[PDB]
């Protein structure tokens, strides 16, 4: 026995403990990340950490124990549903004689003790990329491989840690109260009417459909159930059935608690309305607020993201999981308006990017606007929640509010409520599409329920600094804050984003922000993108292959998208920003959709979806990534065909299972991705003429620049409409005045004969009584005080 293939001889100690200590490291494959043990994973350690860092911990409040009530007694409008056996005959409500302190313990995965399939990097793809690189002469191949391996080695998809969540809360407090403490719109210098005039341009809205119910009813009254499928309708917002119910139902989904949410939402709105018109509105309103304190406390859910391994315990984004009744009531105000307001820069003369999709010509419409602005030597601004985009001095600037939500004051949300109730919930005659009860909830209570309220982590009831990220108004409040920053930029004579004059806008507004991207020589970059467009492959000559040499991309990072010029379509098309593309390839999310995960059909289809989606979003233009992902999806498809396993239904309706499912609803993945798929996703319904875009619904002819100029002159301090004047006065008057405020609104709300004249007289009357400083107190402060009572 001579020349036998060597086998590793090791000590019995090594053998016993299965040690790889001696073994040669395969630098081609990164080791799995194992999160450290978390020292802040106990209520004692977490509370001490927060105390040491001067973070406010509230005196804990208790929720009454659950009591069973008859569904038909609690929800009389749904008696028929109970009778038809379609709805449970009992509801579990917090009306007990005893009470409990709520506890929320979220799961953080992976963790020190569990490094499993959740958050696993795509090592199979890494191996496929490696092998395809050996077999193919792709000039961009080595860089693609390096990038995917580096993302696997440095990032981690998962739900962070308690330390990450706690450190994140500190960062939010610092944004809100630290270097640049928050400022209410009034402190900055804006009245609710002045802000509404800016929002008419930055966030154009339409009124809800005339057939949509006004804000006059208890939520359950918007449910019409008879049994007749043709007439059965809910006029309420839609909900994510598998999402958390929030307080007072920890561990339950919205699906398990819809009847309970309706009972609680009905009760809160009913009690509030009665209290407001009672003999003592202050005592009654404060009692209702205290009784339903839990409707203002969000479960501090750790957000799943592709975090950096080194900053695993330094930063974990949180989702402020709003109580289902609060969510329902807030959504009743925002959704009917927003559903009718998908107005953005591609379809309306507005800087708004609300409802934007880069697909179906969207990216090309943006590129046309960018090119025209560059040609006409004009500045350009675009706004999307906490994202600001500025085109000035042949440069594309991406400005993001620093931890956006943390900059929010209840007054910012109150101004948004004013905008929605004046511009949205209004009839053609100027009369309100709401009653005093709804104006009370919307204007006086709602902003202090989700802004500067509280959250729950473990058994700790913690202060929330700013607005709760994930609440129904997150986008709207963030968009209003960006509007203030942009308005201040215009006022300051449009200082370049790289200057101190631009950075000084942080103090002027009390809103923290940072320049995230500076894309220099824009005009030249766009020219290069067109010139370098390949003649070969997908969207070039139409063949089902990636280009040998991909063209230059205009790296706008416009809501995560870059632009590529297509010779076949003679237009710019979106491709997911490189860094996001690589991170999604390295750390794919799993089947993260309800019970869907238990459906073998969905689980199986997902494995194909996962690779098809990575190709669709931009992988198609990365020769190595397209080659490997195509191979993998085809292999999976072939196994199914050979085995006779049908998942076509899940492949057709794939959108629900992919982080990329948005907008791409009309595309099907039952057939493999081809050049047609790419043509289809990029096909516009209509040709584009920027000059043909309709102007904003309100103040059409006016631009944001014109409105800013008017505001600096002291214009729009007060609305002309008496109905609107009453709503602005509502923001200044203390809760004890609610019964009298209800009387001032009743004529316009009831649309009585001569309501307009009556309202004018009542508004002037109210205006006079507001000369008494004793009557002047923010109901938002009164709400917070009542919510925090023990
Ligand atoms: K701030």
Account of the protein in words:
By secondary structure, the protein is of the alpha+beta class. It has five domains: 42-108 and 161-342 and 402-470 and 778-790, Infectious bursal virus vp1 polymerase domain (Infectious bursal virus vp1 polymerase fold, Alpha-Beta Complex); 109-160, Orthogonal Bundle (Helix Hairpins), CATH 1.10.287; 343-401 and 471-577, no CATH class; 578-685, Helix Hairpins (Helix non-globular); 701-777, VP1, C-terminal extension domain (Substrate Binding Domain Of Dnak, Chain:A, Domain 2, Up-down Bundle). The chain has 30 helices and 17 strands. The strands form six sheets. It has a four-stranded mixed beta sheet with strand order 8-6-12-13. A hairpin with a 2-residue loop joins β15 (554-558) and β16 (561-566). α10 packs across α15 (436-445). The protein is globular, with a radius of gyration of 29 Å. The chain starts with 11 loop residues before the first helix and ends with a helix. The structure holds potassium ion. Potassium ion (K) is lined by residues 175-176, 180, 182, 407, 510-512.
Reconstruct the topology from this structure.
Elements: H1 12-17, H2 43-52, E1 63-70, H3 71-74, H4 79-83, E2 90-100, H5 123-135, H6 141-154, E3 155-158, H7 162-177, H8 185-188, H9 192-202, E4 223-224, E5 233-234, H10 254-276, H11 281-291, E6 297-302, E7 305-308, E8 318-321, H12 324-338, H13 362-375, E9 380-384, E10 387-392, E11 395-401, H14 410-424, H15 436-445, H16 447-450, E12 454-457, E13 460-463, H17 474-491, H18 500-503, H19 505-509, E14 513-519, H20 522-531, E15 554-558, E16 561-566, E17 571-576, H21 578-586, H22 600-616, H23 623-643, H24 648-652, H25 675-682, H26 704-712, H27 722-730, H28 738-750, H29 755-769, H30 779-787
Parallel strand pairs: 6-12
Antiparallel strand pairs: 1-2, 3-7, 4-5, 6-8, 9-10, 10-11, 11-14, 12-13, 15-16, 16-17
Bound molecules: potassium ion.
PDB class: transferase
Keywords: transferase, reverse transcriptase, ipnv
Assembly: monomeric
């Amino acid at each position: 026995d001579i020349f036998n293939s060597p086998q590793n001889k090791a000590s019995i100690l090594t053998a016993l403990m299965k040690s790889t200590t001696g073994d040669v490291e395969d630098v081609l494959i990164p080791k799995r990340f194992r999160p450290a043990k978390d020292p802040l994973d106990s209520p004692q350690a977490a509370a001490q950490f927060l105390k040491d860092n001067k973070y406010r911990i509230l005196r804990p409040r208790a929720i009454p124990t659950m009591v069973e009530l008859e569904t038909d007694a609690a929800l009389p409008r749904l008696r028929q549903m109970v009778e038809d056996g379609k709805l449970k005959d009992t509801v579990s409500v917090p009306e007990g004689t005893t009470a409990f302190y709520p506890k929320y313990y979220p799961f953080h995965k992976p963790d020190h003790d569990e490094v499993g399939t959740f958050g696993a990097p795509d090592i199979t793809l890494l191996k496929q990329l490696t092998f395809f690189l050996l077999e193919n002469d792709f000039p961009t191949g080595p860089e693609t491989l390096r990038q995917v391996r580096e993302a696997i080695a440095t990032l981690q998809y998962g739900s962070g840690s308690y330390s990450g969540q706690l450190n994140r809360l500190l960062a939010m407090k610092g944004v809100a109260t630290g270097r640049n403490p928050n400022k209410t719109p009034k402190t900055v210098g804006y009245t609710n009417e002045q802000l509404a005039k800016l929002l008419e341009q930055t966030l154009p809205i339409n009124t809800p459909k005339h057939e949509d119910p006004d804000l006059r009813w208890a939520p359950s009254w918007l449910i019409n159930y008879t049994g007749d499928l043709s007439t059965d309708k809910s006029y309420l917002p839609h909900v994510t059935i598998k999402s958390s119910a929030g307080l007072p139902y920890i561990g339950k989904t919205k699906g398990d608690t819809t009847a309970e949410a309706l009972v609680l939402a009905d009760s809160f709105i009913r009690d509030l309305g009665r209290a407001a018109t009672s003999a003592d509105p202050e005592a009654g309103v404060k009692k209702t607020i205290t009784d339903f304190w839990y409707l203002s406390c969000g479960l501090l859910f750790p957000k799943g993201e592709r975090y950096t391994q080194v900053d695993w315990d330094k930063k974990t984004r949180n989702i402020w999981s709003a109580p289902y009744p609060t969510h329902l009531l807030l959504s009743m105000v925002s959704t009917p308006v927003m559903n009718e307001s998908k107005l953005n820069i591609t379809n309306t003369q507005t800087p708004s990017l609300y409802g934007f999709s880069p697909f179906h010509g969207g990216m090309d419409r943006i590129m046309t606007i960018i090119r025209d602005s560059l040609d006409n030597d004009e500045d350009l601004v675009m706004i999307y929640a906490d994202n600001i985009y500025i085109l000035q001095d042949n440069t594309w600037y991406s400005i993001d509010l620093e931890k956006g939500e943390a900059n929010c004051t209840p007054q910012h949300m109150q101004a948004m409520m004013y905008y929605l109730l004046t511009r949205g919930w209004t009839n053609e005659d100027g009369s309100p599409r709401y009653n005093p009860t709804w104006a009370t909830f919307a204007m006086n209570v709602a902003p202090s329920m989700v802004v500067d309220s509280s959250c729950l982590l473990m058994n700790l009831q913690l202060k929330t600094y700013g607005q709760g990220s994930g609440n129904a108004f997150t986008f709207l409040n963030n968009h209003l804050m960006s509007t203030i920053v942009v308005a201040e930029w215009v006022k300051a004579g449009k200082p370049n984003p790289m200057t101190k004059e631009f950075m000084d806008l942080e103090e002027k507004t009390g809103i923290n922000f940072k320049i995230e991207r500076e894309l220099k020589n824009l005009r030249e970059t766009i020219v290069e993108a067109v010139e370098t467009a390949p003649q070969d492959g997908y969207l070039a000559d139409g063949s089902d292959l990636p280009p040998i040499r991909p063209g230059k991309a205009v790296e706008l990072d416009l809501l995560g998208w870059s632009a590529i010029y297509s010779r076949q379509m003679e237009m710019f098309v979106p491709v997911l920003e490189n860094e996001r593309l690589i991170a999604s390839a390295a750390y794919p999310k799993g089947l993260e959709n309800k019970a869907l995960a238990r459906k073998p059909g969905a689980e199986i289809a997902y494995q194909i979806v996962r690779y098809e989606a990575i190709r669709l979003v931009g992988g198609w233009n990365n020769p190595l990534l397209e080659t490997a992902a195509k191979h993998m999806s085809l292999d999976k498809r072939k196994r199914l065909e050979v085995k006779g396993i049908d998942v076509t239904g899940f492949l057709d309706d794939w959108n629900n299972m992919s982080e990329f499912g948005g907008d791409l609803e009309g595309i099907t993945l039952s057939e493999p991705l081809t050049n047609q798929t790419l043509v289809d996703i990029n096909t516009p319904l209509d040709s584009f003429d920027p000059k043909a875009r309709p102007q904003t619904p309100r103040s059409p002819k006016k631009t944001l620049d014109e409105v800013t100029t008017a505001i600096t002159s002291g214009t729009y301090k007060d609305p002309k409409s008496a109905v609107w004047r009453l709503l602005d006065q509502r923001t200044k008057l203390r809760v004890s005045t609610l019964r009298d405020q209800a009387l001032a609104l009743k004529p316009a709300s009831s649309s009585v004969d001569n309501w307009a004249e009556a309202t004018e007289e009542l508004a002037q009357q109210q205006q006079l009584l507001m000369k008494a400083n004793n009557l002047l107190k923010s109901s938002l402060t009164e709400t917070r005080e009542a919510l925090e009572k023990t």
